[PDB]
Design a binder for this molecule. Structure first.
Ligand SMILES: Oc1ccccc1CNc1cc(NCc2ccccc2O)ncn1
Lengths: 242, 257
């Protein structure tokens, strides 16, 4: 019968793959600013997700063709023995696009690779995309306007965004992005016990509570950050120790 | 003992105000002929179903049928400017067609951001830090009717068309359908999404955390199928709802003391 507290089965041999695409610099013709602090984000995420049992694979500054080949390769291997799939993008973005080193990629192209008809072995399993991407312009805080649409996807996808329309994303050149810092803090403390959307709700609270009334750079005053997640999940999701 | 101001992973919105709050329902069944939009048989079932379920949760429900865009904006602006100091939260439901960032009123499109914008920060100080929940059943009207001036249970199937827009802190934006999928409405029984939302509200609304409840709705709806005999062309037109959460705490609707 119907179970109001049903959970995703997370008892497979493996947790699954976590991909991280990390973009620090861009081809000069794109005239996009460097993203100092993103290496801190990459390291932070790698630790958190590997502590949760993921096989973490990171890729720095791939060209779009390279990035598409890689994510296509991952979407076509068997995930039969895995609980779930995680994909993280650390870059700049605009509308439904994220930047690779040399060109834009559509987010729907990336998520479409893992829909049921294209990736049988992930059907009914969580497919989690985490996007730190906004508009490209000693610990300095850089502030970027929200630009990437908070796009949905298929059943059992969870799309997690650093910032909503009308707000601003922040990145510290030494400590990393506000959103990734808070996400990783919460993963470290609560990742292995809390329901994951409950955890993302804590991240919403942490990030939106960061004060912007007295920034070192007076131009940044008032530029609040509010993250958000778009859930198409159909069950409760936990990452209990395997 | 007391709760020091330490980060609390279990934190809940305070829901012990004098009143639960207002729930507005904007119900649109037919449209000015120039819009060339089909009527939405079944929407009154949705409206009634929602009214019963939200009233049982303690909400003061106000329904408006087929308002023009000026009228609708006036009404929602009226509600955004009164004091919600004694309320737990605010709910706003749109039952209509839509496109992009727009919902249709009777005579014109309205941008969703203009409606949510009325409840942001000190535009509506007395809702700051309280849940502001928008529920949108709106998709692409099928236009095989004319640009001219004009009971069996059939399932109408409409392509997703309304952007799954976010909003400000403590907003929760609930969508009947995601990009690339299809919204379904039965001309007597009502919309798949609203039917399943209302069934879960009745069974679990006064215990379950509300986003956990919306996740059940995701499961229920994305598992539905149309009878192949009734409409073959509706085969492979699955419905995947979604919600975009900017909430910062757990939301429950326990019975008020
Ligand atoms: O969400 C943001 C973020 C930054 C700036 C502007 C916006 C508003 N625009 C958008 C746009 C958007 N588009 C994708 C789509 C297409 C068809 C149906 C549903 C759907 O979702 N989805 C979400 N937000």
């Amino acid at each position: 019968m119907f179970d109001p507290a049903e959970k995703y089965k997370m008892d497979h041999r493996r947790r699954g793959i976590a991909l991280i695409f990390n973009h620090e610099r861009f081809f000069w013709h794109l005239t996009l600013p460097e993203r100092r602090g993103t290496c801190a984000d990459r390291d932070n995420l790698t630790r958190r997700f590997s502590d949760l049992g993921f096989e973490v694979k990171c890729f720095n500054d791939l060209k779009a063709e390279e990035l598409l080949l890689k994510i296509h390769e991952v979407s076509t291997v068997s995930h039969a023995d895995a609980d779930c799939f995680v994909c993280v993008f650390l870059s700049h973005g605009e509308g439904n696009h994220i930047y690779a080193y040399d060109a834009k990629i559509e987010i729907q192209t990336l998520t479409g690779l893992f829909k049921g008809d294209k990736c049988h072995s992930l059907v009914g399993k969580p497919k989690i995309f985490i996007i730190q991407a906004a508009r490209g312009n000693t610990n300095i805080t850089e502030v970027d306007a929200a630009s990437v649409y908070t796009l949905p996807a298929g059943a059992d996808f969870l799309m997690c965004y650093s910032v909503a329309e009308g707000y601003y994303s922040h990145r510290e050149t030494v400590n990393g992005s506000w959103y990734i810092q808070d996400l990783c803090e919460m993963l470290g403390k609560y990742g292995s016990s809390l329901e994951f959307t409950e955890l993302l709700t804590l991240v919403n609270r942490k990030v939106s509570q960061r004060r912007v009334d007295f920034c070192k750079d007076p131009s940044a005053i008032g530029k609040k950050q509010v993250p958000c997640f778009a859930s198409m999940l159909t069950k409760k999701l936990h990452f209990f120790p395997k």
